Write a protein that binds this DNA or RNA. Sequence first.
RNA 1: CGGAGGAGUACGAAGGUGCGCUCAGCGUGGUCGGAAAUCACGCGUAGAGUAUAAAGGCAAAAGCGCGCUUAACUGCGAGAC
RNA 2: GCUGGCGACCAUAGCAAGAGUGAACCACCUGAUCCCUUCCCGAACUCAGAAGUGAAACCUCUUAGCGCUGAUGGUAGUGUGGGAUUACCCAUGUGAGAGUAAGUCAUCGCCAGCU
Lengths: 174, 77, 137, 114, 97
Amino acid sequence: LKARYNDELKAKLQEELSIKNVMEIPRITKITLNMGVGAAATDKKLLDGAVADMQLIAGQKPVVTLARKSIAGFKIRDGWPIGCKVTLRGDQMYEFLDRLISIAIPRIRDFRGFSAKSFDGRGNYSMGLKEQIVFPEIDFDKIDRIRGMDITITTTARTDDEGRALMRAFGFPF
Amino acid sequence: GSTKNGRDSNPKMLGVKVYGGQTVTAGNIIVRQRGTEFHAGANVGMGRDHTLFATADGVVKFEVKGQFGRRYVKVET
Amino acid sequence: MLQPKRTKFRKVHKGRNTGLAHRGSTVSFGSIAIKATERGRMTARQIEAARRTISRRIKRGGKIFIRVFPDKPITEKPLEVRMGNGKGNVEYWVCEIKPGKILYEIEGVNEDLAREAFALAAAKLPFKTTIVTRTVM
Amino acid sequence: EKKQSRLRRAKSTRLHIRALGATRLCVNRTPRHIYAQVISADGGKVLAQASTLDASLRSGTTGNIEAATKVGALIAERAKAAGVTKVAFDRSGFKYHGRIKALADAAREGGLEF
Amino acid sequence: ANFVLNAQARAEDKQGKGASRRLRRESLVPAIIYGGNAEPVAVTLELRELVKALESNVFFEEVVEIKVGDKVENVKIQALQRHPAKNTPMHADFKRA
RNA sequence: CGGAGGAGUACGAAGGUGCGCUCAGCGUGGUCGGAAAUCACGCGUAGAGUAUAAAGGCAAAAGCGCGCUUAACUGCGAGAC
RNA sequence: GCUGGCGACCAUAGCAAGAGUGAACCACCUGAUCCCUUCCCGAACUCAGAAGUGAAACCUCUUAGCGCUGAUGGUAGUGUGGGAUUACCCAUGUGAGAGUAAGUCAUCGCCAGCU
């Protein structure tokens, strides 16, 4: 993507979707990464490991997310943080979808894990990535136990067909 | 046996003191209210206990105004 | 005995019963109905007894609609007790009745049998009653 | 929405200015143009207007600090003729900085007291 | 044709709670007629005749003629107030047809 | 000696000011997280909250967050309840 | 005629659906060099300019589809005097709420710009 996107994929998306106005072409708006360390109060260090790993993987300082309300079933309440997230836009999001589609997909153990369905219905697509290994980063040594990842893609697509067209133009496996 | 009720507080004497069409001088209290039943308009001041008072000599007037339908009290000079 | 499942307050004031029942004086669930003509109080046991009397004679062949609910609690002092020392204890529930209030409607039964059932039921109630039929206006 | 947020931010300042009963120096910022107005206490009479759409400043860029300073000088010049001396500035929900700050400083240099 | 109800003009002095109760004691039912192109008209009808009309079912879905003097008003029954206890009619509304 | 509940405190911020932000609930997708954890969009709508019992109130929010600070000052006080 | 800003009212003024506008104005749009910003993000805030667009949003016109306004008559209540005492009747004054007919796609000020 980047210049190649702006130059060629916009044009073929217009041609494929047959939309009169140029502005109607779907555009990738942002990608959000979210990971929650449940019951962080118990050990009080998994959170530090998680923010370190997130800072390593993404070129942005993650923001620690506090809980809202108190739930008796769990040990969580409004006091201590329970998760962290980051939102990526601009050149950052472009190089991000880029190196992902470049390096991460050939190595995934099970291809086609991403599905044509699972779309939120408004044109936004959510994926869950297992383990904090499975990216280019530090090896298993010198890092804390494994952790999950959630990625959400929000575009300008007005619906699911437009969204799937945009992902196919980008090169998403399915 | 015995009842477990039987308590109440002393009276507070809340209510309106000056009605519409009355003449007031600066400082006169116009309304005593626990909440903001009435809102101050022109030449009317609000105290810490939500009491409304006159800040100028004139005549009292009541009205309904605003989007919320708030009742207002003002003084016309 | 019908009784509310829950209430905000255990004990209520005596009040006064005046006026007429402009609402609830129209037949809306059946063809024939029994309607009160003088005011009073109607208790839960009386409701149940009248319902039993009507159901027995109609032989459970039609629908009986009960439009009275005993929602008003009534208290009574123990007995051998002097005046004072707080309000009495709830003992039974009643329903206030104003003239024109409908009590029981019958659906799906012959008119003569329904009238006979209402005649049997009226002997159990503490106020005068009449019989009404559905009308267009 | 951006405009709704701006109005909700400016409402408090506008209401306080009305309660204080002071002449209001209102401004509006746009990527292309900037406008300034001087309104009396009642709010129904516009005492002195100014904008970058005037013939003198139209040929310029009209969307930068230089244009803001020119507009401030012009509005101060008109206000002096109008005869209003003491006024209260009103950012109208725009952060007091950059073009707004330059416009206000130009008005102060012109002579309006605020 | 089937339903022709006689009526009389009910002036202002005959309106209000006291006048209405006096009329009902005299066995008369007040009624109102309203509809497009004309102002409301207040009339008084006879209880026996109104009841006889009420027994008929078609009276509610057909047109009826109210005659007061030489004037004739063609209308349809719209509302009927009844005593909650005795069920006797007390008032009537008529929409001009 | 009628019906039904609270009080014998707390806070150098839970005060002042400047600036900024709106709750709660539902509908779709995703890790060991599901009736109920965190995240994205959409629907209707104050039912959220206000240290504490209830009432009257609360959009310039009186609800929520950050920076700087001590007006939680001294001497008074027209006029009112 | 048309756009923007500032005002008086706060649904007869609002919600929903349909149609149109960019010549000027409005918005989107370009970038992180200078000012400024994010408890992470040029998403907001701020700056430098204008390549294109009316897609989104704003604005205007139509539908009563909702929502809203709402008579007349009658009923309930009630001050004074009189008669009764399950809470009513008579004289006189006063008069709802609900429901019905019908109505409603607002209106009036100040400033600047264009064809």
